[PDB]
Write a protein that binds this ligand. Structure first.
Ligand code: ADP
Ligand code: ADP
Lengths: 196, 196
């Protein structure tokens, strides 16, 4: 396989606090975590560097490895392909870093079908009303999108109860509380990443 | 029918500028536009008032008028129903106001099936790259959600070319330019709303 710390799959409804928890996790563990570099077929832009911003490849090569099952997520628009390869995730693992995969539910099931063996964590709000208060606070939603988000979050919370889907489900009632649970769930992989 | 100004249906990819255009439209035309008040079956919260924040009704009543085809959009979570009724839209029209319907593509087709006769306007970015620059600027997206938004916006731009779907398609290259086109498209309904 690929030796190194197991990746972490982070999922949950938008606005529940998984970004706030992740930012604190990174700021308190520099050199421990990493993010996979995406593949694309579009042209590089000023300042971009291969292997850091993207892996720049041809459409023929990218399509070949999509068919080979490498890509846990991929999309296409304006004739250019984009995606995240399991090989790019293993490349972070090879550097003795915990690769962080912040994905929705469809991404979880795509990762479940690969040879990757990550830890699956769901960050859920304590209630739909708290999530509504959270979403109304950031002032990003119409009435249509706010209600659509709350309804979609309900199905997200319900699918989180599916047996074996997630290793850890964190209810973000208190942030300091939720963050401590996140660290404890990752404590063994953090220790492995702390090795040379 | 219901006499008064025709409602306006505003659609387009998130981040293309339809909220910025709408805010300027409201701030330069007070008393001219209005927003429909939604129906819900949930309990009122502190400070909320019937007929202003929501129309509070029973589940039996709301289900009856959903089956009657009143609701251009509706959703349910935690045992409570939410939705926008064509009657609430006509109630804004009855006050000689232009009712603003800011909805996605599915909302457009739901409105198309009612007795409402609004003006259908699509606000599109000049390119997907401009939209990406716009989305990256507001710092709300993961890499997964950013690419998903760009791909979804491509299908949104493509469906905007569907014959007869939209009365006006506004390409938001320059904001002052796009806003002037928005005012001109609504100039006759604004004049009607300016009548007593
Ligand atoms: N721990 C928390 N307590 C209260 N509100 C929160 C918390 N975390 C997030 N929010 C609200 O949710 C919004 C976005 O949450 P975020 O941290 O991005 O979670 P996610 O990554 O799941 O969207 C924030 O603007 C804030 O208003
Ligand atoms: N006219 C514009 N020119 C440049 N950037 C814009 C413009 N309108 C919107 N944006 C970018 O898009 C983001 C949100 O756009 P918004 O006005 O909410 O459009 P929408 O309502 O379609 O989401 C803004 O934070 C801004 O970065």
């Amino acid at each position: 396989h690929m030796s190194g710390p197991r990746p972490v799959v982070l999922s949950g409804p938008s606005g529940a606090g998984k970004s706030t928890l992740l930012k604190r996790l990174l700021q308190e563990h520099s050199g421990i975590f990493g993010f996979s570099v995406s593949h694309t077929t579009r042209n590089p832009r000023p300042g971009e560097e291969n292997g850091k911003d993207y892996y720049f490849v041809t459409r023929e090569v990218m399509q070949r490895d999509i068919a080979a099952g490498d890509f846990i997520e991929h999309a296409e628009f304006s004739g250019n392909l984009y995606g995240t390869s399991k090989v790019a995730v293993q490349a972070v693992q090879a550097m003795n870093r915990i690769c962080v995969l912040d994905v929705d539910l469809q991404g979880v099931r795509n990762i479940k079908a690969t040879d990757l063996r990550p830890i699956y964590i769901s960050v859920q709000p304590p209630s739909l009303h708290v999530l509504e208060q959270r979403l109304r606070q950031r002032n990003t939603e119409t009435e249509e999108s706010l209600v659509k988000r709350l309804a979609a979050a309900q199905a997200d919370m319900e699918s989180s109860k599916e047996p074996g889907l997630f290793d850890v489900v964190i209810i973000n009632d208190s942030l300091d509380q939720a963050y401590a649970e996140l660290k404890e769930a990752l404590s063994e992989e953090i220790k492995k990443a702390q090795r040379t």
